Homo-oligomer: A and B are copies of this chain.
Amino acid sequence: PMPPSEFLDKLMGKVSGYDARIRPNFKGPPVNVTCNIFINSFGSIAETTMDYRVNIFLRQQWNDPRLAYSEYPDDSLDLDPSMLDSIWKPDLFFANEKGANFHEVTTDNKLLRISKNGNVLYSIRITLVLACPMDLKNFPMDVQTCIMQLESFGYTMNDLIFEWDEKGAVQVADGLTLPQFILKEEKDLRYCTKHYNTGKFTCIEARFHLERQMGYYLIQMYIPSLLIVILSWVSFWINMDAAPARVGLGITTVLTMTTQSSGSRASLPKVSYVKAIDIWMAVCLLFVFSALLEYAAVNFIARQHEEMRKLFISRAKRIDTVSRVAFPLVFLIFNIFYWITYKII
C-alpha cells in the first residue's frame, strides 16, 4: 500500500479539512482525556524554597473522530514528533509548576499513537519543579503531603474534562529512594475543579505522603543532649565544699550544651518559628541552667552561719538530697510529655 507517514499526511493535510486548532466533538459533548503518570525520579525536597522536583512520563488518552480510518491495514499508527504540530492536543498544565521543561536529547522525548477508531495515546517526558507548602512545626516527627495537580489552561469544564484512568493512575519506578523522607505507597486521587473569574477549569490531583526518617536526629541531636543533662546531675553527688568542682562542672555543662545546640543549627532548616527540636534544645538548656542555680543556693545557705550553724548546714544538705531525686523526676515528666505529644500527631 502506502507508508504510514504518507497516510497520516493524507489524513491531516490541507484536504479533508482537519484543523489542529479545533477540539474533537466541537460544539458537542466535552473531550474526556484520561491520564496517568509514571514517576522516574523524585526528590530534592527543598524547604526554604518549599518545592520538590519530579521526573515523569505523562500519558494522555482521548478520542478524536476526525482521526478515524479504515483504509490502512494495520490497527495502529504512530506519528513522528516532528509532525506533532498537526494534532489537537490538550492544553494540560500543572497548577503548581514553579518551573518545568521537556527533554529533547537525541530526539524529542515524545510519543504519539493514533488507533483505528480514533483513540490517541500521547506520552511525553517532563521534569517538574512542583511546589508543596511544608509545615515544619514538629520537625523530626512530621508527615508531609505534596500534591501534583493537573489543570486545563484554556478550555473550560464544558469543553474538556480530565480523569485518572481506573487502572494504575500513578506508577513509581522501583529503585527510588530519598535522602531524608520515605515515600508511602498510598496515593490519594481526587478532583479539584478550579473556579476563576474566567471560568470553571477541570483539574485532577495526586497526593504523595512523605514520612521523615528519625535515626539521624536521635543519634546526633537527642541522645547527645540527653547525656549532657545526665552529666549535669553528677554535681548533686559531689559534696558541698568542693566549690571549684561544682561550678566547674556546672558551667562546662552549660557550655557543652551551647556547643551541641549551636553546632546543630546549621543542619536544621531556616524557618522563623519554633519547631519540636527547638523546644527540646531549649528545655534541656533549662535543666542544665537550673542545676547551677541549685548550687548557688547551696553555697549561699551553707555560709549564713553554736546550735544555729548546724541548721544551715542541715538545710543545705536537705536541698542537695531533694534535687538528687527531683531532677531525674522532673526531666522524666517532660520526657514523657514531649514524646507523647509528638507521637499523638
Residues on A close to B: CB < 8 A?
Answer: 3-6, 19, 21-22, 26, 38, 40-41, 43-44, 47-50, 55, 57-59, 78, 80-83, 85, 89-103, 105-107, 109-111, 121, 123-127, 131, 133, 135, 153-154, 168, 175-177, 179-181, 196-198, 212-220, 223-224, 227-228, 230-231, 234, 237-239, 242-249, 251-256, 258-267, 269-275, 278-279, 281-282, 285-286, 289, 292-293, 296, 299-300, 303
Assess the A264–B262 pair: CB atoms within 8 A: yes
User: Which of A80, A94, A245, A299 has the most CB atoms of chain B within a 10 A radius of its CB?
Assistant: A245
Tell me whether B227 and A272 are in contact (CB under 8 A): no
When distances are taken between beta carbons in the complex, the residues of chain B under 8 Å from A135 are 177
Contact A106 B22 (CB under 8 A): no
Name the CB-closest residue of B to A282.
Answer: B219
Contact B248 A259 (CB under 8 A): no
A interface, over-half SS = mixed
Chain B residues whose C-beta falls within 8 Å of the C-beta of A248 in the assembled complex = 244-245, 247-248, 251-252
Given contacts A180-B271, A248-B251, A251-B256, 9 further A-B contacts (CB under 8 A): A59-B197, A90-B106, A93-B106, A94-B105, A111-B154, A238-B296, A244-B244, A261-B263, A266-B267
**Total copies of the chain:** 5
Assess the A198–B251 pair: CB atoms within 8 A: no
> A234 CA to B92 CA in the complex, in Å?
68
Q: Contact at A124–B98, with CB atoms within 8 Å?
A: no
- With A234-B247, A243-B242 already in contact, the answer to whether A43 and B50 are too (CB < 8 A) is yes
Partner of A230, one of B22, B111, B239, B289: B289
The answer on a CB contact under 8 Å between A44 and B38 is no
Supposing A153-B109, A231-B251 touch, asked if A177 and B265 sit within 8 A by C-beta, the answer is no
Q: Chain B contacts of A89 at CB under 8 A?
A: 106-107
CB distance from A217 to the nearest CB of B (A): 7
Name A295's closest neighbour in chain B (CB-CB).
B234
Task: Give the residues in chain B near A245, CB-CB below 8 Å.
Answer: 243-244, 246-248
Asked if B254 contacts A255 (CB within 8 A), the reply is: no
- Shortest distance between the CB of A276 and any CB in chain B (Å): 11
Quick one: which of B103, B105, B273 contacts A102, CB cutoff 8 A? B105
Contact A92 B106 (CB under 8 A): yes
What's the minimum C-beta distance from A319 to chain B, rounded to whole angstroms? 15
